[model samples]
Target: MAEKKLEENPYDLDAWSILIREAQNQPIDKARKTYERLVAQFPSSGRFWKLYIEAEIKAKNYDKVEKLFQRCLMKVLHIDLWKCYLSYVRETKGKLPSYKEKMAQAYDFALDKIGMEIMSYQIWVDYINFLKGVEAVGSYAENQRITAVRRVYQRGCVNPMINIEQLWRDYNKYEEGINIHLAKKMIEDRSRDYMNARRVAKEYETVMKGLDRNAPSVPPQPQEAQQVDMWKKYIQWEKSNPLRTEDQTLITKRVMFAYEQCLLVLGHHPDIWYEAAQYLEQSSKLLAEKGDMNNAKLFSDEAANIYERAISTLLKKNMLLYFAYADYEESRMKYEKVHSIYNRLLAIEDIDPTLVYIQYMKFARRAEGIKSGRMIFKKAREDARTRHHVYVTAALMEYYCSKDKSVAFKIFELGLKKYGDIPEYVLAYIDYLSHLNEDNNTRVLFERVLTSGSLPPEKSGEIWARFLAFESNIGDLASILKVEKRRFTAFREEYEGKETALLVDRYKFMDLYPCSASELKALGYKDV
Candidate 1:
């Protein structure tokens, strides 16, 4: 009777519950197969998709989760499913070089699908957080990323369903770190809607007072009305230029006093402590250079003490603080202390041991001698499994420190054997060979990279550009044209009738050879 009931109403909750119970006792492969059939029959069921996702995660079939989620999103646009998709992407796709761009597309799709819904504010918040996490180094790219973040903030602020006042406050705080002028402008622009005119006015007042030569005799204490902003502004003022020795001493004293006051209330925040430690370290260096060792020592000791306190008070192990503390000791040439920090960090299990190992090896190479460094490198190579960059660093060290090209080549070969599927390792190896003037070897490496199906199709553009450059530099005109054609064909196939921003711009290759542009034109590639 139960089987007959299930056959009649397969999509019913009771039927699904029976199936889920049965699957729980079965092997994951069989369980997933059952889910696959259930979802096929009931494509619009978000509950089934969630169950399938959970099953996939348990089975460690992470690659399938993406495609399955894509289909799930197509059939059902539940907020929970969208959140699950975003969460999965963050956890799995985070390390990819193209993570931001790819996730940006997902964010846009999510917003376009369910953005107008009153309860969609959580999705916007998550999207905003994703944008906040992006880190770029170049001025142009960093500015572009920041601009993208600002646009998200703008949209979120205008979202009436959202807590607009809180959004404005968070946006104001985000802008403050990158650009004070822009931050002030944001506050001013949103003051009427958000009723933040008081905060805006206070910010302007602080700026004006900051410029005064004869400011208040007493340092301002943190207050409930404007605690974080005032403390940040005070520190910024103390660090600004025209830092005379006498003025530096006085400013440092004031900043330290303010730091203590702020930390009393903000003791739980590690970032606040990190920033204080950084400022103190800089002050120490400046004072030491100005023949003020006594005060310098005082600042240095305080910085170290602050870092220690941060480590103790932090809710979780912060690898960044560990690295920063190690860096401080290293900067002061306190090798023994730095070594101790490295040792302690290495003992931590959850952190990225590969990075710490590389840092420790580099330090050992510089301070203790190449032998000690080599010992560490061997251990790291054995233990750092699947982190190909560590091997690249080891190879570079062998090349430069030991002057053994053969050893470096061996490391590259060994790394390729272990992680040959990763495009970064292939590219790094080719670059290493190029640096050693192995032009022929570089070509051979590119040949392998181009043929390596391990590389994702979407990420092939960069490798293709590098490959074309190599051919343009070394090969004759005919070979160059052939390489160009191959690259364009591969690019088109990878994009596959889709609108992609990927382009084989001739400008980048123009300076490589005078005929580079002409060859591209002859190969039937025209200017856009």
Candidate 2:
């Protein structure tokens, strides 16, 4: 009997190479089989299961789709994957699949992922599409769809990939529906919030004027009319329905657009403190997440004037960290302002370590000398309260790059003493050693990370690109072609053109290396 060549174990290196080749050839069936086999061998990986189900479903192998769907469904729970599975059921069932539970589950997954935020453009689109699809086959819940779209918008638009032009085009061509009504309601609610907020301002000013000039002027406080009538209107708008994003948008627009109205109508009012707090803590977060950081900071400063705790909390929020002012002068870069703020922040007890890291990284990047940056980072690392080892790791990587070979070697031991076994930091130090011409230390670090666990290719690729660019200039045609071909061919096989194309462009990075490419190759039409 002839010995059969099993393409190694599907979980091993051999099968990966073979499947990559099949995927490159666009052999859908063969690719699907290999992917399935890999999933079978390594059932622990949710990612592989997702890919296998995707390939089989795309191929219209409904039997295989059903099979893989069953296998993957329990372990894998991505909304898009479930959507595709639900779509498959509808196609086969002729009527809607009795998978209402699955649809609800998918909806829950999306909600769980996003929480209660409004205004993720992608989430809005995703929810709308899901509703439209489910409605086509079954009795869709209109209220839920409306609420989901509203909630997404309320969170604020973070998805930059959304085609604004397409939305405008579609909006013009199509008639208004619940989505439009909800959007209008949101805008109106915010307008009302602004209106009430202004009313509160006026009443406060009245009190201010009535105060005796000889006495210390206590800030005029909110009258009952401002509280019960004005703020009530804003809150009532929020409570009117299911708290849709449209409603939230109304609030958002009012606070943001009616800044002058707020300043003019109620600027002197006593309720400005609460309004300032709300705007700084809540509204500013949304605006910052929406990429309006400058405005976020401006609102935060207002909060700081009235209530420092609210300001502190606002500065600590994730969206605010990158943009929050730390008295750092922009002209000074990372050096001067960083140390003063670091000491000031350290003196403040019970602050979020993440906030400190956020500022530290922001400042670290500006330091003129790697040695000086490292020294500051070393101090932060010594602080037992701050849990920002990753940041320290990143800084160490940069510092290690410019150090002498002996110094670089000693730095690795110090890193291990301070931070535990984090491979990213170790590998970065290795890359630094490699850059310093310490080949032995570089190889040791490389080998350690290589066997320790799989490197996330995206990160390693960037590191690899940076390292390889220093190997030989792009002017050396033979070396350039060699590196380009090696990278493209390897990535083309592994990622199937998506990442390979990007890696090729990485070669053309500005101020790094010169690149000459045929137009045929640049647009990726050479073979065709």
Candidate 3:
């Protein structure tokens, strides 16, 4: 059964242990062989090392456990393995000089390696219990003994762990037992510290509730606001380093895990992917500056993987992600990658291709120059699914880039043939020509848009008001009232004189369109 389980996943710790136990119950040779293979396969997990080292003593088969202890220290400190090694040292070293100093020295040895781990609470208690047990020789010895014992307790109280509350209680008792008056002030101050640590510790639990196993089988390949909110909580929580371990390497590892886990669950969420890729790029720069260009490239490459995964999954739902992806590659000055991203994005039909097409034109113009920009615009205009705004941007691109008014006017003229019904599209020209104070061109464009009759009267209300407002600002009374009369009659025809004010309401007499004394009274209302 165990071997069968290992067939699918040899890394499964559960079944590997199942094999280890069957051998350990009977044969030392079998158990030793089992442990040897286990440690080879799994050096990283502490329980695997501890499971091998401690049992050698328990079974009285002390066959070179010394090297086991020596070999494992350079790896990441695993608390369980250290605890087993500590006991092994105490049992074997046996009064080599003086057991007390030797054991105390050994205790510091184990702790100094692993004490910064958030869950290394048990060993501190073990260290304290052993400290309290030994006898003091004189006044000096007793005072030092008290300080040494209290030191571990105080350190344990502040560094948050699973049993932090219990550690605080133990600390309060130990401090009061030593000296009630001085301990009160120290305990109160330290009490505040523990409170802060433990509160953040509790918050850590709440934020990380569903993160571990909550992620579905992974990505969107097979299979909500609340889920997004939860991952965000964990992201911010890890970002803050709630356990507050000061090791940069450890902090970086934890934060990286947070982003990876967040992406697996929220892979379809574009902004989270955006944030994750962004954070990876930032960390890549940080690593590069510290002269770890190898690892920095790994981080930078992984950030690209995130972008690849994001654009692949989120392409249909939102093309906004591609823009950011293009920007990322552009920042690296990977112009071909940026160009390819835009090209691939434009190929997808169902998505709103306006933004990507527009961005491609801008990027192409900036990167490759005006000829390529015109090529991109031409391709976009030929596409059946390309949006109205694509042409608007194209016109503006020429207008701004070459300052070629004739070219822009021709593009707008071409766009009007296809999108003449859209008031939103026509108003862009009015606003542009108005911005340049080309009053005659603005008047001609306004009359052209109004007379096209491509849009219904109700739909043209906004363009009418805009034209009326423009004429009010720049034209004589003849033009202003003429536009107003055209608007009034247009609406009267549309709603048969009903809801006339709906269109006319935007026409401000003195620009105080909200409420005035006489206007309020005319509408049977009062105002201050």
Candidate 4:
């Protein structure tokens, strides 16, 4: 976001971010203005947001603290968001109205939201310790102070987050220290569920490596591609559902978690939005096919929602991705929707007129039929920006779809009148005819090009070679002989200097029908 223009537009969260110490150097006057915009970008972040909150605490500027913290924690359940708040209360006893009494609810609110965070182990330790010192009638319901402390251990230990071992040990230690009978009952109560979560917790410890849990605390480096690559790699690992279970909803939650964290860390990387959306679209397609329409529609709606949000927010950078979105859906097999989508890309103005139309034609022929293929070609032919390949594309489509062959031939002939001078069009037409096995027609097309002399000698050699190769496969001995001698005439300088070069080429090119030893001798002085 260093060079990014963030002052004018409020919506480009992709370009709206700051470093922690950068704000530390600049005082709150401008930092407040900068963070004024940061907090607006919801489903908010943690490391930097926590840094800002802590910086304010240091500066004794505390009015906007509640504003920023509430705005963030409501939108996102980030551990740092909660951890900084919990720690802030402990450090500032004078500010809150008897800090221990006023802030225990804030602890509950914070932990309830993000206690399962892989590193919320840090916060839970601080919080439960804060609670133990929290005296009865120094808190709510007299005996319930201990009950509340006991409740947190039960809540957090059941989560398969990073430090499940320490959390469970703390829970077991707390329970047995109070009452042996209670510890026995507590183990009985939680043992089955704790065991289930531990397997996933151990899996998390291994599979969740190579991912940074927070956005970088400093300015992004010139060599920052690795950070992004690591995020993408971790996102892919979660996408494969590396957990030890068949529960698909939970598996998808893991993927969604990775995506949310990835979007936070690399918000400027716009394709991850498209990549995320495409996965949802495909998975929803599978569910819809499997007859789970309720969940399928929910996922599909979210995929489209992601597409719409990404397109609206990243409008300037999302051109190719818009085209990709078309390729992702297959029109949903709707000709109306496909046409609507293609026309949007056509109107988009950055894309090539030719390439899009070529793809549009390919798609039209597949979904709508030859009618739309011909229809779109007529519109393309009328358009001033159209290119040469489109005519060939339309002609080839007719060749495949129209059995009469006259329509395809007419398309080819019409294209030849317009693009006849282009050697590529002429060669493609020649090959098209040859593939049809139309012997006389292919030769006629070749003879007309060779005789017209429209091509320069430099271009003629390539065109002549293709013609010669066609004859090698299709024509008899005299036929192969005529073209080889013709090709030799076209390359007179090199062949006349070294006749064996041309002879050896003919030897292999004519491997389908080799002439006898005497025939080689007749053509040139060779061993018989």
Candidate achieving the largest TM-score: 4
> Model 4 reaches what TM-score against the true structure?
0.64
Let me know the TM-score candidate 2 reaches against the reference structure. 0.28
**Model 2, CA-based lDDT:** 0.47
Show model 2 residue runs off by greater than 4 Å.
Answer: 1-352, 358-431, 434-448, 451-459, 473-528
> What C-alpha lDDT, on a 0 to 100 scale, does residue 429 get in candidate 4?
78
lDDT of 4 by residue, 1-528 (tens): 542555544444345543333655698776766655454453346765776676677678666677667666564556667777776666665366677676777777776666645666777777788777766664456457678788778777767788888888888888887787868987788878787777667766665576666653222323348767877777777777665567665666667666766666565566687788878887787788778888887887677666655555434335556556556556454457667666776776565677778877788778777787777788788867777788888888777777657877888888887877788888877888888887888899898888777655556666776776777777877987888787778778756855663555454643432666666566663331
Model 2 per-residue lDDT tens digits across residues 180-227: 655555455544433343344333334333322111112244443343
Clashing pairs in 4: none
The candidate with the higher TM-score, 3 or 4, is 4
Put down candidate 1 lDDT per residue, 1-528, tens digits, no spaces. Answer: 545776775535566667778977887788987888777655445666788887887777888887787676754545566677877877788889988888888888887665533346677878888877778788997888878888887776654443555666788888897878867887678656444323332333354343221111111232333555655675565455212334676567646644653454444456777888888888888998989899789988889987876665432366677778887788778988988887787776677687878888888888878888887787787774428888899889988988999889898988877777766777788778876766787888777767867666566666776776677677777877777677767776645433222234433443443345566555444332
lDDT of 4: 0.69
lDDT of 4 at 5: 52
lDDT of each: 0.68, 0.47, 0.73, 0.69
Instruction: Say which prediction, candidate 1 or candidate 2, comes out ahead on TM-score.
Output: 1
User: Per-residue lDDT for 471-496 in model 3, tens only?
Assistant: 77888778877887788788766545
Candidate 4: where are CA atoms >4 Å away?
Answer: 1-117, 120-155, 169-187, 212-246, 259-293, 303-324, 334-337, 382-386, 451-457, 474-500, 507-528
Pairs of residues at least 3 apart in sequence or in different chains that clash in candidate 3: none
Which candidate ranks first by lDDT, i.e. highest? 3
